[PDB]
């Protein structure tokens, strides 16, 4: 059987998540699609610096599995993903410019939460 329907606030969160994964934002969202493969990227200090990795595929799996009990829990994972990028990478890195752009998409639409 299916999972019960997302709450109204979590429907809005799922909408945002679909947008962040959509071809619309692919030019700057792609680094966030899958877990950072630290070994593949040569980032052999990544897991010493980032204790709680997060990425959009993990957020999608957690939404599908009803792991998130409210919008706040969802938003915390999306912000963790951005914070990890801002912690690990120097502020003038191309990936940080991409994070700032995708976070602007996220924060402005998250602000339109129904209540
Ligand atoms: C969330 N991703 C990262 O923190 C990350 C750190 C270092 C390198 N890369 C690859 C990359 C992306 C974009 C431009 C250049 C290189 C990452 O994705």
Swiss-Prot record:
Summarizing the annotation, the consequence of altering residue 89 to A is: Abolished binding to histone H4 acetylated at 'Lys-12' (H4K12ac)
The entry's stated outcome for residue 41 to A is: Reduced binding to histone H4 acetylated at 'Lys-12' (H4K12ac)
Q: What is this protein called?
A: Bromodomain-containing protein 2
Q: Which residues form the Bromo domain?
A: 4-113
How does the entry describe the domains? The first bromo domain specifically recognizes histone H4 acetylated at 'Lys-12' (H4K12ac). It also specifically binds histone H4 acetyl-methylated at 'Lys-5' and 'Lys-12' (H4K5acme and H4K12acme, respectively). The second bromo domain recognizes and binds histone H4 acetylated at 'Lys-5' and 'Lys-12' (H4K5ac and H4K12ac, respectively).
Q: Which family does it belong to?
A: Belongs to the BET family.
State which gene encodes it: BRD2
According to its UniProt entry, this protein's organism is Homo sapiens (Human)
Q: What does this protein do?
A: Chromatin reader protein that specifically recognizes and binds histone H4 acetylated at 'Lys-5' and 'Lys-12' (H4K5ac and H4K12ac, respectively), thereby controlling gene expression and remodeling chromatin structures. Recruits transcription factors and coactivators to target gene sites, and activates RNA polymerase II machinery for transcriptional elongation.
Per its UniProt entry, which superkingdom is the organism in? Eukaryota
Other notes on this protein? Answer: Some specific inhibitors of BRD2 that prevent binding to acetylated histone are promising therapeutic molecules for the treatment of cancers or inflammatory diseases. ABBV-744, a small molecule, has been tested on tumors with success: ABBV-744 antiproliferative activity is mainly restricted to cell lines of acute myeloid leukaemia and prostate cancer and is able to displace BRD4 from chromatin. GSK046 (iBET-BD2), which specifically inhibits the second bromo domain, is a promising therapeutic small molecule for the treatment of inflammatory and autoimmune diseases.
Give the fragment's position in the full-length protein: 344 to 455 of 801
- Subunit and interaction comment: Homodimer. Interacts with E2F1. Interacts with (acetylated) STAT3; promoting STAT3 recruitment to chromatin. Interacts with CTCF; promoting BRD2 recruitment to chromatin.
Compartments reported by the entry: Nucleus; Chromosome
């Amino acid at each position: 059987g299916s999972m019960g329907k997302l709450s109204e606030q979590l429907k809005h969160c799922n909408g945002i998540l679909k947008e962040l994964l959509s071809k619309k934002h692919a030019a700057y969202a792609w680094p966030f699609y899958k877990p950072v493969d630290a070994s593949a990227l040569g980032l052999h200090d990544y897991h010493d610096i980032i204790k709680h990795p997060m990425d959009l595929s993990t957020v999608k799996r957690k939404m599908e599995n009803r792991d998130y009990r409210d919008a706040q829990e969802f938003a915390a994972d999306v912000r963790l993903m951005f914070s990890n990028c801002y912690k690990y990478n120097p502020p003038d890195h191309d990936v940080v410019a991409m994070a700032r752009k995708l976070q602007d998409v996220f924060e402005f639409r998250y602000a339109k939460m129904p209540d």
